Each structure stands twice: as structure tokens, then as C-alpha cells.
Amino acid sequence: GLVPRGSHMAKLASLTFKGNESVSSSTLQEQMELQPDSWWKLWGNKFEGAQFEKDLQSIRDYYLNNGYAKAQITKTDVQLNDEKTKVNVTIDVNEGLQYDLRSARIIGNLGGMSAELEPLLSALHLNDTFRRSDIADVENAIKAKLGERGYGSATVNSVPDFDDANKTLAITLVVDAGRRLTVRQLRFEGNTVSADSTLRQEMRQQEGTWYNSQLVELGKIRLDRTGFFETVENRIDPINGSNDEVDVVYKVKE
């Protein structure tokens, strides 16, 4: 069967990094929400892995945003005390080399937008330190561009080619525009003040026709500008057993 279990707290006593020759322990620790002297929730001899994993990902993101494209978290060790108070964490990193971005290319299924996607690669800083977050920004710009023509589910995947001798890397962005999508319904979540049909009236994406990322964004803007909402967000909802139709959902927090 299933049985209830309750949690106790223990303080994160020490944070130790191993293998980080080029980036300081203090800088790595700064990427983490879990800091020494903060409390760690334990259940029996189990710890919450969710936040720790996000902290490990922030460490990875830092390396990848500062040129260390092959950086890996090699091992982690969460140890207790005998006393159920104080955990001590050890994180091993393999930093690898710091790379410059030498080139970037787009390939794949481009939904007829090859010429309009190419100029987006200009945002990148060639012959400069590789920065993952710059690539991620190009990926989102590619998706927004393809969204103009209905390809609201386009995927982009960055594929590296490493030159360790010269400490450069080449990026191939593998794009799959996917299918042109038709919007079936515009749906609103979180709205109590105004009826769904009232909000729908402020949207510029229309139901029953092609998704257009520009008109979808414009609705989110038209809601943001009123000031009536803490957050405005939108997403694409797949429809069971369709590959060609989707719903667009606007999530407001009042």
C-alpha cells in the first residue's frame, strides 16, 4: 500500500567543489539557490532532488554561457552527520576547455523561410567566447519567425562540432518547422473579471485559421498593456489525434 511520511529539516553545512580549475567555487556557489546555512528538507534518509537538480543545472548553464561547452557535473555526494542535522554536499566538475564560436549554420525543414531565417544568425558573436544563451536566443527567434507562417510547433536543436586544438566550436542549428497549424479555439485560463468571449474580443489571432505567432503575441501585448494582470502568458495546446489543429490558451493572473 501507500503510507504517509513526514519531513525533517537539516542545515546545509558545507558546499565543496572538485575539479573546478578555471571557475571559482564562490562563483559556482552563486549560481545555486541552495546555500550553506539554508535548510534542506529530508524524508527519512531521502532528500529533495528537485531543487538540487535545478541548482546543478544552473551550474551547467553558467559553464555553457561562459565558453565551457563540454563542462559536465561528474559526480555529487550528499552526506549527513550521524546526527540528523547538517548535510555536506560535494560536487565534482569536469570543466573542459573554454571555446570560441567560429561559425553557425541553419539546416533542415525551413518552411520556405530559408532566406528570412539566415539573418537571425547575425546576433551571434563569432570568434568570441561561446555563449549557450546566445544560441538559445537564436533558437527562439527562429521559432518566432517560422510562427509567422503557421509553424507554431517548430523545433530547433543545436548540434556542436568541436575543435579542441584551436578551442573553437561550430554550431549547426537543426530546424524542423513541422506542420502548419490551424487554431481551433482561443481559450482563457485564470480570468474571473472578464468573460472568455470578452477577452477573446481583444485577441488578434482568429479561430479557425492559421496560427500566426505575431498575432498571438499581439494579443498578449494588448492584455499586458492594460495593467489589469500580474502575468499574461500564452501556449499551444495539442488536440488529441490531430497533427494540424491546435488550441491557443492565454493564462492570465489577475
XYZ file of N, CA and C in Angstrom:
762
model
N 0.808 -1.208 0.000
C 0.000 0.000 0.000
C 0.843 1.261 0.000
N 0.217 2.403 0.283
C 0.908 3.680 0.419
C 0.720 4.176 1.846
N 1.763 4.773 2.411
C 1.718 5.236 3.797
C 2.251 6.662 3.896
N 1.679 7.510 4.751
C 2.216 8.866 4.900
C 3.588 8.872 5.559
N 4.386 9.862 5.168
C 5.714 10.104 5.713
C 5.929 11.596 5.891
N 6.505 11.966 7.029
C 6.771 13.360 7.325
C 8.237 13.735 7.200
N 8.503 15.031 7.082
C 9.808 15.573 6.733
C 10.481 16.202 7.945
N 11.804 16.071 8.029
C 12.574 16.895 8.953
C 13.551 17.751 8.158
N 14.091 18.764 8.824
C 14.992 19.719 8.203
C 16.401 19.493 8.730
N 17.376 19.814 7.892
C 18.775 19.760 8.271
C 19.473 20.880 7.522
N 20.487 21.459 8.150
C 21.153 22.603 7.556
C 22.219 22.144 6.577
N 22.266 22.796 5.426
C 23.378 22.577 4.516
C 24.614 23.186 5.158
N 25.548 22.334 5.578
C 26.713 22.817 6.312
C 27.790 23.323 5.360
N 28.293 22.459 4.481
C 29.372 22.844 3.587
C 29.040 22.454 2.156
N 29.551 23.264 1.236
C 29.453 23.046 -0.200
C 30.871 22.964 -0.742
N 31.230 21.824 -1.327
C 32.586 21.600 -1.807
C 32.543 21.285 -3.289
N 33.409 21.952 -4.044
C 33.575 21.713 -5.465
C 34.936 21.082 -5.708
N 34.972 20.112 -6.617
C 36.203 19.455 -7.025
C 36.309 19.473 -8.540
N 37.532 19.658 -9.037
C 37.784 19.705 -10.461
C 37.587 21.052 -11.125
N 37.132 22.072 -10.394
C 36.861 23.386 -10.984
C 38.142 24.223 -10.973
N 38.991 23.985 -11.978
C 40.277 24.676 -12.047
C 40.138 26.113 -12.547
N 39.211 26.370 -13.475
C 39.137 27.660 -14.149
C 38.050 28.586 -13.615
N 37.095 28.078 -12.841
C 35.998 28.882 -12.315
C 35.944 28.666 -10.814
N 35.871 29.763 -10.069
C 35.994 29.722 -8.621
C 34.794 29.045 -7.978
N 35.056 28.381 -6.852
C 33.984 27.805 -6.053
C 32.931 28.845 -5.687
N 33.356 30.063 -5.339
C 32.387 31.083 -4.946
C 31.459 31.446 -6.098
N 31.997 31.542 -7.317
C 31.154 31.822 -8.475
C 30.150 30.699 -8.697
N 30.601 29.446 -8.603
C 29.696 28.313 -8.787
C 28.610 28.313 -7.720
N 29.004 28.474 -6.457
C 28.026 28.541 -5.378
C 26.986 29.627 -5.627
N 27.391 30.742 -6.245
C 26.464 31.839 -6.503
C 25.355 31.458 -7.473
N 25.572 30.449 -8.321
C 24.541 30.000 -9.249
C 23.429 29.220 -8.563
N 23.626 28.823 -7.312
C 22.742 27.896 -6.625
C 21.782 28.646 -5.719
N 20.539 28.168 -5.654
C 19.625 28.652 -4.626
C 19.918 28.005 -3.277
N 20.278 26.724 -3.267
C 20.635 26.047 -2.023
C 22.016 26.525 -1.577
N 22.053 27.362 -0.530
C 23.267 27.959 0.016
C 23.596 27.371 1.388
N 24.871 27.308 1.776
C 25.184 26.940 3.162
C 24.373 27.796 4.126
N 23.980 27.197 5.249
C 23.128 27.777 6.295
C 21.649 27.821 5.924
N 21.253 27.388 4.731
C 19.843 27.217 4.415
C 19.412 25.810 4.808
N 18.104 25.611 4.878
C 17.544 24.374 5.395
C 17.182 23.440 4.252
N 17.465 22.159 4.456
C 17.267 21.120 3.460
C 16.214 20.176 4.015
N 15.174 19.934 3.228
C 14.073 19.085 3.648
C 14.395 17.633 3.330
N 14.312 16.791 4.354
C 14.653 15.381 4.271
C 13.423 14.570 4.652
N 13.279 13.409 4.023
C 12.209 12.473 4.352
C 12.895 11.137 4.575
N 12.956 10.712 5.831
C 13.768 9.555 6.153
C 15.203 9.887 5.798
N 15.842 8.982 5.062
C 17.180 9.209 4.533
C 17.141 9.630 3.067
N 16.065 10.292 2.657
C 15.891 10.785 1.297
C 15.927 12.301 1.340
N 16.469 12.909 0.294
C 16.436 14.354 0.185
C 15.687 14.747 -1.076
N 15.181 15.978 -1.069
C 14.508 16.523 -2.241
C 15.509 16.751 -3.361
N 15.296 16.089 -4.491
C 16.273 16.152 -5.554
C 15.880 17.209 -6.551
N 14.657 17.728 -6.424
C 14.143 18.655 -7.428
C 14.949 19.946 -7.445
N 15.030 20.628 -6.302
C 15.753 21.894 -6.258
C 17.244 21.689 -6.459
N 17.798 20.620 -5.895
C 19.217 20.351 -6.086
C 19.532 20.199 -7.571
N 18.698 19.457 -8.303
C 18.911 19.301 -9.737
C 18.865 20.646 -10.458
N 17.935 21.529 -10.076
C 17.917 22.862 -10.678
C 19.197 23.618 -10.367
N 19.716 23.453 -9.153
C 20.984 24.078 -8.804
C 22.119 23.496 -9.638
N 22.117 22.178 -9.850
C 23.136 21.586 -10.710
C 23.011 22.103 -12.136
N 21.781 22.344 -12.600
C 21.586 22.861 -13.950
C 22.056 24.305 -14.068
N 21.851 25.112 -13.022
C 22.368 26.478 -13.034
C 23.889 26.494 -13.115
N 24.549 25.532 -12.463
C 25.998 25.410 -12.601
C 26.352 25.090 -14.045
N 25.669 24.105 -14.628
C 25.908 23.772 -16.028
C 25.675 24.985 -16.917
N 24.546 25.678 -16.717
C 24.239 26.848 -17.535
C 25.346 27.892 -17.456
N 25.911 28.108 -16.266
C 26.986 29.089 -16.144
C 28.180 28.698 -17.001
N 28.625 27.447 -16.887
C 29.737 26.993 -17.710
C 29.417 27.182 -19.188
N 28.221 26.762 -19.608
C 27.867 26.809 -21.023
C 27.694 28.239 -21.517
N 27.356 29.169 -20.624
C 27.257 30.569 -21.002
C 28.596 31.289 -20.977
N 29.665 30.635 -20.516
C 30.983 31.252 -20.470
C 32.031 30.429 -21.215
N 31.612 29.668 -22.221
C 32.534 29.044 -23.145
C 32.862 27.591 -22.865
N 32.530 27.076 -21.684
C 32.913 25.715 -21.306
C 31.852 24.733 -21.806
N 31.849 24.554 -23.129
C 30.783 23.817 -23.798
C 30.763 22.334 -23.437
N 31.894 21.752 -23.040
C 31.943 20.347 -22.648
C 31.856 20.147 -21.139
N 31.630 21.213 -20.371
C 31.560 21.079 -18.921
C 30.504 20.055 -18.532
N 30.833 19.227 -17.542
C 29.897 18.251 -17.006
C 30.005 18.217 -15.489
N 28.870 17.997 -14.830
C 28.865 17.626 -13.418
C 29.161 16.132 -13.361
N 30.342 15.780 -12.857
C 30.806 14.401 -12.941
C 30.205 13.535 -11.845
N 30.036 14.089 -10.650
C 29.555 13.309 -9.524
C 29.045 14.271 -8.462
N 28.089 13.802 -7.663
C 27.629 14.542 -6.500
C 27.523 13.599 -5.311
N 27.676 14.164 -4.115
C 27.701 13.389 -2.877
C 27.012 14.217 -1.802
N 25.848 13.759 -1.346
C 25.119 14.377 -0.243
C 25.285 13.492 0.988
N 25.948 14.008 2.021
C 26.249 13.243 3.226
C 25.612 13.904 4.441
N 25.242 13.076 5.418
C 24.607 13.561 6.638
C 25.609 13.853 7.756
N 25.246 13.526 9.001
C 26.055 13.872 10.167
C 26.211 12.783 11.219
N 25.473 11.670 11.141
C 25.227 10.757 12.261
C 24.046 11.372 12.989
N 24.274 12.572 13.506
C 23.197 13.458 13.909
C 22.369 13.790 12.676
N 21.047 13.802 12.821
C 20.202 14.085 11.666
C 20.197 15.562 11.308
N 21.191 16.304 11.786
C 21.371 17.711 11.478
C 22.639 17.892 10.657
N 22.602 18.831 9.718
C 23.726 19.163 8.843
C 23.976 18.131 7.745
N 23.828 18.554 6.489
C 24.259 17.784 5.328
C 25.459 18.495 4.715
N 26.389 17.715 4.172
C 27.556 18.251 3.475
C 27.566 17.741 2.040
N 27.622 18.674 1.086
C 27.493 18.380 -0.336
C 28.848 18.511 -1.012
N 29.129 17.597 -1.937
C 30.337 17.635 -2.748
C 29.945 17.498 -4.210
N 30.469 18.388 -5.048
C 30.138 18.427 -6.468
C 31.436 18.375 -7.263
N 31.595 17.336 -8.080
C 32.755 17.196 -8.952
C 32.382 17.718 -10.331
N 33.250 18.547 -10.911
C 33.015 19.095 -12.240
C 34.204 18.754 -13.124
N 33.909 18.535 -14.399
C 34.912 18.386 -15.444
C 34.716 19.579 -16.367
N 35.567 20.595 -16.222
C 35.280 21.866 -16.877
C 35.513 21.770 -18.377
N 36.566 21.075 -18.787
C 36.963 21.100 -20.172
C 37.474 22.469 -20.593
N 37.648 22.603 -21.903
C 38.236 23.797 -22.479
C 37.200 24.908 -22.618
N 37.698 26.144 -22.665
C 36.884 27.311 -22.978
C 36.948 27.569 -24.481
N 35.798 27.509 -25.144
C 35.720 27.569 -26.595
C 35.229 28.918 -27.103
N 35.731 29.295 -28.276
C 35.152 30.366 -29.073
C 34.196 29.781 -30.107
N 33.170 30.553 -30.447
C 32.244 30.184 -31.513
C 32.836 30.629 -32.844
N 33.177 29.675 -33.714
C 33.748 30.047 -35.004
C 32.700 30.192 -36.099
N 31.563 29.513 -35.992
C 30.573 29.597 -37.058
C 29.248 29.023 -36.584
N 28.202 29.335 -37.348
C 26.848 28.886 -37.068
C 26.115 28.740 -38.394
N 25.350 27.660 -38.528
C 24.593 27.400 -39.744
C 23.209 26.878 -39.383
N 22.277 27.054 -40.319
C 20.909 26.561 -40.199
C 20.690 25.511 -41.276
N 20.127 24.368 -40.885
C 19.758 23.317 -41.821
C 18.409 22.753 -41.402
N 17.793 22.013 -42.327
C 16.631 21.205 -42.021
C 15.432 21.612 -42.877
N 14.257 21.500 -42.258
C 13.000 21.834 -42.918
C 12.605 23.237 -42.468
N 12.773 24.204 -43.365
C 12.728 25.620 -43.034
C 11.409 26.286 -43.414
N 10.390 25.508 -43.771
C 9.093 26.058 -44.116
C 9.131 27.173 -45.142
N 10.057 27.090 -46.096
C 10.183 28.106 -47.125
C 10.747 29.430 -46.664
N 11.301 29.493 -45.454
C 11.767 30.742 -44.866
C 13.288 30.806 -44.794
N 13.976 29.988 -45.594
C 15.434 29.925 -45.558
C 16.068 31.312 -45.542
N 15.648 32.186 -46.461
C 16.278 33.500 -46.583
C 15.936 34.410 -45.411
N 14.763 34.230 -44.810
C 14.351 35.062 -43.688
C 14.944 34.586 -42.365
N 15.354 33.317 -42.282
C 15.986 32.790 -41.075
C 17.472 33.127 -41.020
N 18.148 33.095 -42.165
C 19.588 33.345 -42.203
C 20.006 34.619 -41.481
N 19.365 35.773 -41.693
C 19.810 36.989 -40.991
C 19.768 36.885 -39.477
N 19.006 35.947 -38.916
C 18.971 35.802 -37.465
C 20.299 35.322 -36.895
N 21.125 34.646 -37.693
C 22.437 34.224 -37.217
C 23.386 35.393 -36.987
N 23.000 36.615 -37.362
C 23.870 37.769 -37.169
C 23.956 38.200 -35.712
N 22.961 37.860 -34.893
C 23.016 38.167 -33.467
C 24.174 37.489 -32.748
N 24.828 36.515 -33.370
C 25.886 35.758 -32.719
C 27.224 36.466 -32.868
N 28.097 36.235 -31.897
C 29.394 36.897 -31.828
C 30.456 35.867 -32.187
N 30.854 35.881 -33.452
C 31.788 34.912 -33.984
C 33.196 35.256 -33.525
N 34.021 34.223 -33.369
C 35.394 34.395 -32.910
C 35.429 35.036 -31.529
N 34.389 34.785 -30.746
C 34.276 35.264 -29.381
C 33.847 34.079 -28.525
N 33.961 34.230 -27.207
C 33.642 33.129 -26.304
C 32.258 32.569 -26.608
N 32.177 31.243 -26.725
C 30.890 30.594 -26.934
C 29.959 30.885 -25.766
N 28.718 31.241 -26.081
C 27.710 31.560 -25.071
C 26.414 30.842 -25.442
N 26.111 29.756 -24.724
C 24.900 28.979 -24.989
C 23.660 29.859 -25.060
N 23.542 30.832 -24.152
C 22.313 31.612 -24.084
C 22.118 32.460 -25.335
N 23.208 32.845 -26.009
C 23.084 33.476 -27.322
C 22.486 32.520 -28.349
N 22.879 31.243 -28.303
C 22.304 30.261 -29.217
C 20.832 30.049 -28.901
N 20.493 29.953 -27.611
C 19.099 29.771 -27.229
C 18.241 30.918 -27.745
N 18.779 32.140 -27.730
C 18.022 33.288 -28.222
C 17.778 33.183 -29.724
N 18.764 32.696 -30.479
C 18.555 32.494 -31.910
C 17.513 31.410 -32.138
N 17.544 30.356 -31.319
C 16.553 29.293 -31.447
C 15.141 29.841 -31.289
N 14.924 30.697 -30.290
C 13.594 31.255 -30.077
C 13.205 32.208 -31.201
N 14.165 32.980 -31.714
C 13.880 33.855 -32.848
C 13.520 33.050 -34.090
N 14.189 31.914 -34.296
C 13.830 31.034 -35.405
C 12.400 30.546 -35.245
N 12.029 30.138 -34.028
C 10.675 29.648 -33.793
C 9.641 30.751 -33.975
N 9.958 31.976 -33.550
C 9.013 33.070 -33.745
C 8.843 33.379 -35.225
N 9.941 33.346 -35.980
C 9.881 33.630 -37.410
C 9.031 32.595 -38.129
N 9.314 31.315 -37.893
C 8.522 30.261 -38.513
C 7.069 30.361 -38.077
N 6.833 30.842 -36.857
C 5.478 31.031 -36.375
C 4.674 32.016 -37.199
N 5.346 32.949 -37.888
C 4.621 33.878 -38.751
C 3.779 33.148 -39.785
N 4.265 32.011 -40.272
C 3.631 31.274 -41.351
C 2.844 30.068 -40.866
N 2.683 29.904 -39.557
C 1.839 28.853 -39.024
C 2.580 27.731 -38.348
N 3.910 27.694 -38.456
C 4.701 26.586 -37.923
C 4.958 26.794 -36.428
N 3.866 26.756 -35.660
C 3.909 27.072 -34.243
C 4.585 26.023 -33.384
N 4.831 24.831 -33.928
C 5.482 23.759 -33.188
C 6.883 23.462 -33.715
N 7.499 24.414 -34.409
C 8.832 24.201 -34.952
C 9.808 23.835 -33.843
N 10.714 22.915 -34.148
C 11.788 22.553 -33.236
C 13.109 23.063 -33.792
N 14.030 23.370 -32.885
C 15.407 23.692 -33.235
C 16.314 22.981 -32.246
N 17.372 22.367 -32.761
C 18.306 21.615 -31.935
C 19.723 21.995 -32.336
N 20.509 22.464 -31.373
C 21.871 22.912 -31.636
C 22.809 21.720 -31.548
N 23.610 21.525 -32.593
C 24.457 20.353 -32.747
C 25.903 20.840 -32.888
N 26.809 20.485 -31.975
C 28.167 21.045 -31.996
C 29.193 20.236 -32.777
N 30.187 20.961 -33.299
C 31.394 20.372 -33.881
C 32.604 21.017 -33.213
N 33.323 20.249 -32.398
C 34.399 20.782 -31.569
C 35.761 20.676 -32.244
N 36.547 21.747 -32.128
C 37.964 21.759 -32.495
C 38.752 22.061 -31.221
N 39.210 21.012 -30.537
C 39.878 21.201 -29.254
C 41.251 21.841 -29.418
N 41.972 21.488 -30.489
C 43.303 22.050 -30.709
C 43.274 23.572 -30.716
N 42.290 24.162 -31.394
C 42.184 25.610 -31.502
C 41.124 26.181 -30.578
N 40.444 25.336 -29.806
C 39.455 25.794 -28.838
C 38.371 26.615 -29.530
N 37.827 26.048 -30.605
C 36.669 26.606 -31.281
C 35.594 25.535 -31.385
N 34.381 25.972 -31.707
C 33.277 25.052 -31.924
C 32.378 25.624 -33.007
N 31.823 24.747 -33.837
C 30.852 25.134 -34.849
C 29.473 24.630 -34.452
N 28.466 25.479 -34.620
C 27.095 25.145 -34.255
C 26.300 24.928 -35.533
N 25.607 23.799 -35.602
C 24.587 23.555 -36.610
C 23.244 23.545 -35.897
N 22.368 24.466 -36.277
C 21.012 24.503 -35.738
C 20.113 23.672 -36.647
N 19.686 22.513 -36.158
C 18.833 21.622 -36.931
C 17.391 22.042 -36.684
N 16.770 22.604 -37.712
C 15.427 23.162 -37.636
C 14.460 22.187 -38.293
N 13.332 21.932 -37.632
C 12.206 21.227 -38.244
C 10.956 22.074 -38.033
N 10.527 22.779 -39.081
C 9.364 23.649 -38.956
C 8.110 22.860 -38.601
N 8.070 21.574 -38.948
C 6.892 20.789 -38.655
C 5.713 21.186 -39.532
N 4.518 20.997 -38.990
C 3.293 21.229 -39.737
C 2.770 22.639 -39.527
N 2.150 23.171 -40.577
C 1.406 24.414 -40.459
C 0.163 24.162 -39.625
N -0.038 24.975 -38.605
C -1.084 24.722 -37.630
C -2.257 25.664 -37.854
N -3.461 25.135 -37.667
C -4.684 25.921 -37.627
C -5.156 26.016 -36.187
N -5.585 27.207 -35.791
C -6.062 27.437 -34.434
C -7.544 27.094 -34.403
N -7.900 26.106 -33.584
C -9.299 25.738 -33.412
C -9.982 26.692 -32.439
N -9.513 26.723 -31.195
C -10.083 27.561 -30.152
C -9.030 28.473 -29.537
N -9.440 29.702 -29.214
C -8.726 30.557 -28.272
C -9.377 30.405 -26.905
N -8.612 29.889 -25.946
C -9.080 29.594 -24.600
C -8.350 30.473 -23.595
N -9.072 30.896 -22.560
C -8.509 31.694 -21.475
C -8.590 30.957 -20.143
N -7.474 30.953 -19.421
C -7.393 30.466 -18.052
C -7.106 31.626 -17.104
N -7.540 31.479 -15.851
C -7.235 32.452 -14.822
C -8.121 33.683 -14.792
N -9.047 33.833 -15.740
C -9.871 35.036 -15.859
C -11.177 34.909 -15.077
N -11.352 35.763 -14.063
C -12.611 35.881 -13.334
C -13.334 37.199 -13.571
N -12.624 38.267 -13.936
C -13.253 39.575 -14.077
C -14.016 39.648 -15.390
N -13.386 39.218 -16.479
C -13.956 39.337 -17.810
C -14.242 37.945 -18.361
N -15.381 37.809 -19.034
C -15.762 36.547 -19.652
C -14.772 36.163 -20.747
N -14.729 34.864 -21.046
C -13.833 34.375 -22.087
C -14.083 35.097 -23.404
N -15.355 35.282 -23.762
C -15.699 35.960 -25.006
C -15.283 37.425 -24.992
N -15.336 38.072 -23.825
C -14.834 39.438 -23.716
C -13.342 39.499 -24.020
N -12.555 38.646 -23.367
C -11.121 38.613 -23.639
C -10.849 38.225 -25.087
N -11.503 37.161 -25.564
C -11.367 36.754 -26.958
C -11.502 37.937 -27.907
N -12.342 38.914 -27.552
C -12.537 40.080 -28.405
C -11.272 40.922 -28.519
N -10.402 40.882 -27.510
C -9.178 41.673 -27.543
C -8.056 40.992 -28.313
N -8.255 39.752 -28.737
C -7.227 38.984 -29.415
C -7.234 39.318 -30.901
N -6.067 39.184 -31.532
C -5.961 39.378 -32.969
C -5.737 38.085 -33.731
N -5.261 37.036 -33.071
C -5.377 35.697 -33.624
C -6.849 35.318 -33.679
N -7.295 34.820 -34.827
C -8.668 34.374 -35.002
C -8.754 32.854 -35.018
N -9.874 32.344 -34.516
C -10.112 30.911 -34.517
C -10.448 30.433 -35.925
N -10.149 29.164 -36.183
C -10.466 28.554 -37.457
C -9.542 28.880 -38.604
N -8.391 29.501 -38.350
C -7.454 29.822 -39.416
C -6.034 29.637 -38.896
N -5.071 29.964 -39.747
C -3.685 29.614 -39.486
C -3.140 30.345 -38.265
N -2.472 29.588 -37.397
C -1.663 30.176 -36.342
C -0.733 31.231 -36.925
N -0.612 32.352 -36.217
C 0.306 33.421 -36.600
C 0.919 33.947 -35.306
N 2.178 33.579 -35.056
C 2.839 33.956 -33.810
C 2.794 35.458 -33.578
N 2.812 36.247 -34.650
C 2.761 37.695 -34.486
C 1.419 38.140 -33.915
N 0.315 37.594 -34.431
C -0.999 37.976 -33.921
C -1.259 37.391 -32.537
N -0.695 36.220 -32.238
C -0.809 35.656 -30.896
C -0.078 36.532 -29.884
N 1.179 36.870 -30.172
C 1.916 37.802 -29.325
C 1.160 39.112 -29.145
N 0.582 39.632 -30.225
C -0.061 40.939 -30.162
C -1.229 40.925 -29.175
N -1.938 39.794 -29.074
C -2.971 39.665 -28.056
C -2.406 39.700 -26.652
N -1.285 39.012 -26.434
C -0.650 39.027 -25.120
C -0.186 40.430 -24.758
N 0.301 41.177 -25.744
C 0.693 42.564 -25.517
C -0.525 43.395 -25.145
N -1.603 43.247 -25.915
C -2.796 44.055 -25.707
C -3.379 43.815 -24.319
N -3.134 42.632 -23.746
C -3.520 42.364 -22.366
C -2.492 42.904 -21.375
N -1.199 42.727 -21.659
C -0.161 43.280 -20.792
C -0.323 44.779 -20.578
N -0.671 45.514 -21.634
C -0.658 46.970 -21.564
C -1.741 47.520 -20.644
N -2.854 46.800 -20.458
C -3.945 47.332 -19.647
C -3.547 47.525 -18.189
N -2.590 46.742 -17.698
C -2.192 46.826 -16.313
C -3.037 45.967 -15.394
N -4.103 45.352 -15.919
C -5.068 44.602 -15.122
C -4.542 43.258 -14.645
N -3.352 42.848 -15.065
C -2.878 41.495 -14.820
C -1.454 41.506 -14.299
N -1.208 40.599 -13.361
C 0.137 40.392 -12.852
C 0.993 39.665 -13.881
N 0.457 38.606 -14.492
C 1.116 37.931 -15.601
C 0.140 37.701 -16.749
N 0.668 37.731 -17.973
C -0.045 37.242 -19.148
C 0.884 36.303 -19.899
N 0.378 35.123 -20.236
C 1.156 34.093 -20.902
C 0.255 33.414 -21.921
N 0.871 32.783 -22.920
C 0.110 32.023 -23.900
C 0.879 30.757 -24.240
N 0.140 29.729 -24.658
C 0.745 28.462 -25.040
C -0.089 27.801 -26.122
N 0.513 26.807 -26.771
C -0.150 25.981 -27.776
C -0.565 24.672 -27.114
N -1.862 24.353 -27.181
C -2.392 23.095 -26.662
C -2.640 22.102 -27.785
N -1.957 20.952 -27.821
C -2.269 19.948 -28.845
C -3.678 19.402 -28.677
N -4.258 18.974 -29.794
C -5.572 18.342 -29.827
C -5.378 16.859 -30.107
N -5.834 16.025 -29.176
C -5.794 14.576 -29.317
C -6.152 14.152 -30.734
N -5.243 13.399 -31.349
C -5.435 12.821 -32.663
C -5.442 13.802 -33.810
N -4.969 15.029 -33.599
C -4.695 15.947 -34.693
C -3.201 16.226 -34.759
N -2.698 16.421 -35.974
C -1.372 16.974 -36.180
C -1.433 18.362 -36.801
N -2.625 18.818 -37.196
C -2.793 20.041 -37.963
C -3.540 21.138 -37.221
N -4.281 20.797 -36.175
C -5.044 21.764 -35.402
C -4.508 21.840 -33.981
N -4.536 23.051 -33.419
C -4.186 23.296 -32.026
C -5.128 24.350 -31.464
N -5.209 24.388 -30.137
C -5.816 25.495 -29.419
C -4.711 26.412 -28.909
N -5.018 27.704 -28.816
C -4.139 28.686 -28.188
C -4.770 29.130 -26.877
N -4.019 28.988 -25.789
C -4.504 29.252 -24.439
C -3.752 30.445 -23.861
N -4.492 31.477 -23.454
C -3.940 32.622 -22.735
C -4.186 32.451 -21.235
N -3.103 32.411 -20.451
C -3.154 32.261 -18.993
C -2.895 33.610 -18.321
N -3.951 34.256 -17.814
C -3.823 35.491 -17.036
C -3.851 35.197 -15.539
N -3.083 35.973 -14.774
C -3.173 36.008 -13.316
C -3.674 37.396 -12.936
N -4.846 37.467 -12.317
C -5.481 38.759 -12.065
C -4.929 39.445 -10.816
